[PDB]
Amino acid sequence: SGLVPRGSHMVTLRQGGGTVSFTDSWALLPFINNTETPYAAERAEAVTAALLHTHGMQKLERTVTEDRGELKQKAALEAAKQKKVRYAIAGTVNEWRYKVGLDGEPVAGFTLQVIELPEEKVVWSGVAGKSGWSRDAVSAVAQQVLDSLIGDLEKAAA
């Protein structure tokens, strides 16, 4: 035996006033990497950018690549202020790994904050995570989790 359940959780919260618009001006900051997996922040950012475009966010300021990235993210927030973007997405990778034990479980987790600029007010935030089955890649579990979060942001954007 061995009991190895799989699971996924997501919590999101909307604050502020009226709707936030995906047609407004957006920035996607560098992710902070809170895992032992090198380059998880960069892969999380690439997956997130592609999902945002898919969901219809065309005007998305991004930061070319190149340490957990706290300073890069702070500096990118300042760059978004100077570019006069309305909303910045600040993301942290909480988990990104292929746990091997009795079987294989890819895990991925993220926390996302949407910050309205210039006032630096959080208008939405979300936390989600998922563990998969042995045949799933970590990248597919991460894409699912970020798809749920962005799908929720779009709905909660009202």
> Binders of a copy of itself among 71-90, rule CB under 8 A?
73-74, 90
10 forms part of the interface with a copy of itself (CB under 8 A): yes
C-beta closer to a copy of itself: residue 59 or 99: 99
Specify the residue, 74 or 81, whose C-beta has the smaller distance to a copy of itself: 74
- Nearer residue to a copy of itself within complex by CB, 59 or 134: 134
Q: In sequence order, what DSSP letters do the residues of 80-140 get, joined into one string?
A: HHHTT-SEEEEEEEEEEEEEESSSEEEEEEEEEEEEETTTTEEEEEEEEEEE--TTS-HHH
Report the run of H or E that residue 40 belongs to, with start and end: helix 40-54
Placement of tokens 């988990």 in the chain: 95
Q: How far, rounded to the nearest angstrom, does the alpha carbon of residue 8 sit from its chain's CA centroid?
A: 15
Interacting positions 108-127 with a copy of itself (CB under 8 A): 111-113, 122, 125, 127
Rounded distance between C-alpha atoms, residue 57 and residue 62, angstroms? 12
How far does Cα 121 stand from its chain's mean position?
18
Q: Kindly state the smallest distance separating residue 113's Cβ from a copy of itself, in Å.
A: 6
| Cα angle, residue 150 at apex, residues 145 and 151 outer, rounded to 5° | 95
Tell me which stretch binds a copy of itself (CB under 8 A): 33-41, 48-56, 58-66, 80-88.
Answer: 33-41
Q: Can you tell me which of 22, 26, 35, 123 binds a copy of itself, judged by CB under 8 A? A: 35
| Site membership for a copy of itself, residue 13 (CB under 8 A) | yes
Question: Any contact of residue 70 with a copy of itself (CB under 8 A)?
Answer: yes
Residue among 68, 81, 98, 139 that touches a copy of itself (CB under 8 A): 68
